[PDB]
Amino acid sequence: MKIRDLLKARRGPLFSFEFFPPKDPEGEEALFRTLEELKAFRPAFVSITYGAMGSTRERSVAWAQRIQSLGLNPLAHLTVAGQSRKEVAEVLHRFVESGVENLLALRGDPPRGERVFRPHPEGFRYAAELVALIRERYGDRVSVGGAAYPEGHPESESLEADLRHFKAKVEAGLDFAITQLFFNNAHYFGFLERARRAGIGIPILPGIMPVTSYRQLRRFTEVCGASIPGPLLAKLERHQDDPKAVLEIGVEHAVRQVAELLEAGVEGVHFYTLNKSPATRMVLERLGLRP
Amino acid sequence: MKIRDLLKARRGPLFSFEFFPPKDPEGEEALFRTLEELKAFRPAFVSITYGAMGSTRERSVAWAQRIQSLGLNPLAHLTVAGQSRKEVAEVLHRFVESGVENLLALRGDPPRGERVFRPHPEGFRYAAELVALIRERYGDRVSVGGAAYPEGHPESESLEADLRHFKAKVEAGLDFAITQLFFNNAHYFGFLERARRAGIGIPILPGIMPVTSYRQLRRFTEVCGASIPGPLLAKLERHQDDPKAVLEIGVEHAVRQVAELLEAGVEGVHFYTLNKSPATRMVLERLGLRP
Ligand SMILES: Cc1cc2nc3c(=O)[nH]c(=O)nc-3n(C[C@H](O)[C@H](O)[C@H](O)COP(=O)(O)OP(=O)(O)OC[C@H]3O[C@@H](n4cnc5c(N)ncnc54)[C@H](O)[C@@H]3O)c2cc1C
Ligand SMILES: Cc1cc2nc3c(=O)[nH]c(=O)nc-3n(C[C@H](O)[C@H](O)[C@H](O)COP(=O)(O)OP(=O)(O)OC[C@H]3O[C@@H](n4cnc5c(N)ncnc54)[C@H](O)[C@@H]3O)c2cc1C
Ligand SMILES: Nc1nc2c(c(=O)[nH]1)N(C=O)[C@@H](CNc1ccc(C(=O)N[C@@H](CCC(=O)O)C(=O)O)cc1)CN2
Ligand SMILES: Nc1nc2c(c(=O)[nH]1)N(C=O)[C@@H](CNc1ccc(C(=O)N[C@@H](CCC(=O)O)C(=O)O)cc1)CN2
Ligand SMILES: [Cl-]
Ligand SMILES: [Cl-]
Ligand SMILES: [Cl-]
């Protein structure tokens, strides 16, 4: 089913799960066994992150197919970095021809943690251009989401400019958005309020990634642009050499985050799930949301 | 200044304060000494609650004039209960001719000790009818707000019906709304999300009243329609006969609420302040907003 339809129809919050390209063949098989086990949670949709510069272009199409053949609903991530417009359109075509009904249109990061993005010579610069391409070619026959940033893209000059750019991307033809991970719910609620004042009505699903390793904080702050609230940071610093303690801290924090989001009427939660980590399923189990 | 203009031009949250009709002449002078002291805080606007059934209709106009003469910006509350349309229109005209630029258009509750609202036979039935009068008769000469109910008016059939009627009130000509008091921030955030999905973009300011006595809970739940979160209700139940402890519980609860609302970038906070209670001042001190 199209995500826009799942959202309109829901009997309760939609839970979705995003995984990562596996590192080796054993890991790939283990990921697909995990997806099979994940039916226990009745996921609204599942995805695997797309390699930013197109490194996974063939594998990603085959993964979308394999997800569908397990009876799960794939959200196909697609980026524009490192790829020509023709190359992007070819991958898009292969997803849709495969029966994919749901696309997440993304830019991609610049490589190796560089601050400044440079498009491929015959490529796109902005996710909005890929949203518009999808609509030009497929109209409403697919559902299209994009990324939202409650705390702003790191490269944006202000939250106000970042919101204007989000509105422009919505206007290119998004049906929904999924946020960047965050640890401070107030920043998600603040972004929703800015969106409301700007006349944005589409569903905006919070993205949650429980902290599972202390080493993650550098990526979360430097790449993702997420802030770590005082109390959480202090607990992680105090236990930074104890991986078991860190996991429990991250799960407990995410449980409290998700409980408040649900009480605040979110349409769903999108869980960023490291392939070998049980943390996101632990969060749903602790909230009593395992069917 | 018109509240619509203050909101558009704001550089940080607007803080507003609502007091109550004084009970005797010394209480009246004491209230105006409190308002004089409040000037240093630079509130965006201040108000005194309009008495049930028109009981303060002349005093309220004089009080709005006295607020102006202190250099403060009055918000004039005006209800329709227990008064003819012509009477309401007369008080409205007195406010406008006093130089009041800001009106809060309200229905009013049924009279003390009655549970059913019945309009005056030649009066208005809904706040939206007053909003419409103001727009027809004064247009942009005034800025008009209305009440919003994150947890629904008690007498509404459902939250969906409540929101539809809120939307109709907005459409009649609101520039902003101020919420009913609440104790669970998630219900405020949830209301904003429902409003966003219904295409309501006007500023909606949270109303906060710290719990100062156990006896208040009856009014808060039965008349105001607010829910009391379990942990708060537990603490209060245990300390009913310790007023000092109840004040501390209420103040701390309100501090934590407001800290999160401010982190969520609300356009302002509206404090319901009993004239002789230090609770609001204590909240502002604990937040670092007042010395
Ligand atoms: C839910 C989710 C899933 C993701 N999945 C993947 C994935 O599978 N693969 C991957 O590589 N990455 C993925 N990402 C990461 C994403 O690619 C990066 O965060 C990237 O740096 C920005 O992508 P974007 O689509 O948000 O960019 P865009 O929306 O294109 O924005 C890029 C920058 O340009 C600015 N901008 C936009 N419009 C204008 C304008 N009109 N004028 C000026 N500036 C403008 C924006 O504010 C922003 O600073 C994901 C992110 C999220 C939140
Ligand atoms: C910020 C704030 C300040 C206040 N100040 C005062 C004050 O100074 N003095 C005072 O007496 N009271 C005051 N009140 C209280 C208010 O008068 C009561 O809560 C009252 O019961 C409802 O007033 P309202 O304006 O919200 O009613 P309305 O908006 O008129 O709604 C009344 C009921 O009718 C329903 N409804 C609305 N339109 C329609 C329609 N077209 N058809 C059918 N049903 C409809 C609503 O859903 C609701 O159930 C204040 C409340 C707030 C939140
Ligand atoms: N800017 C941006 N935001 C994004 C993404 C991204 O790539 N870039 N993601 C998707 O595109 C998601 C986040 N992706 C993540 C990928 C890895 C780790 C992580 O914990 N990595 C470990 C190292 C793991 C390893 O080497 O095996 C770490 O940083 O310690 C965290 C988040 C959502 N938002
Ligand atoms: N429905 C409704 N909502 C409303 C109002 C109202 O009158 N009715 N208010 C504005 O119109 C504000 C709340 N007004 C309040 C008025 C008094 C007390 C209170 O504490 N009263 C004491 C009695 C004190 C006494 O007898 O002097 C109590 O209930 O214990 C609380 C809130 C905001 N919302
Ligand atoms: Cl964006
Ligand atoms: Cl006139
Ligand atoms: Cl209403």
Residue numbers in the entry:
A (entry chain A), B (entry chain B): 1 to 291
What does the paper say about this structure?
The flavoprotein methylenetetrahydrofolate reductase (MTHFR) catalyzes the reduction of N5, N10-methylenetetrahydrofolate (CH2-H4folate) to N5-methyltetrahydrofolate (CH3-H4folate), committing a methyl group from the folate cycle to the methionine one. All MTHFRs share a highly conserved catalytic domain, despite varying oligomerization states, such as a dimer in Thermus thermophilus HB8 (tMTHFR) versus a tetramer in Escherichia coli (eMTHFR). All MTHFR catalytic domains share the same β8α8 barrel topology, a typical triose phosphate isomerase barrel structure.
Here, we report the structure of a tMTHFR holodimer in complex with an N5-formyltetrahydrofolate (CHO-H4folate) substrate analog. We found that in the presence of CHO-H4folate, the tMTHFR dimer adopts the same intermolecular interface as the tMTHFR with half-FAD occupancy (dimer mode 1), despite the presence of FAD in both active sites. In the ternary complex of tMTHFR with FAD and CHO-H4folate bound (referred to as “tMTHFR•CHO-H4folate” in this paper), we observe that the folate pterin ring is stacked against the si-face of the FAD isoalloxazine ring. As a result, a unique PABA pocket is observed in the tMTHFR•CHO-H4folate structure, in where Phe20 and Arg219 now sandwich and enclose the PABA moiety. As a result, the distance between the N1 of FAD and Asp109 increases to 5.3 Å. The repositioning of Thr49 in the tMTHFR•CHO-H4folate structure is of particular note. The Thr49 hydroxyl group hydrogen bonds with the Glu18 side chain in the tMTHFR•CHO-H4folate structure, a residue whose polarity, as previously mentioned, is essential for catalysis As a result of the Thr49 relocation and its hydrogen bonding with Glu18, an extended quartet is now formed in the active site that also includes His270 and Ser16. The longer distance observed between folate N5-C and FAD N5 in the tMTHFR•CHO-H4folate structure indicates that the ligands and active site residues are not in an arrangement (as) conducive to hydride transfer.
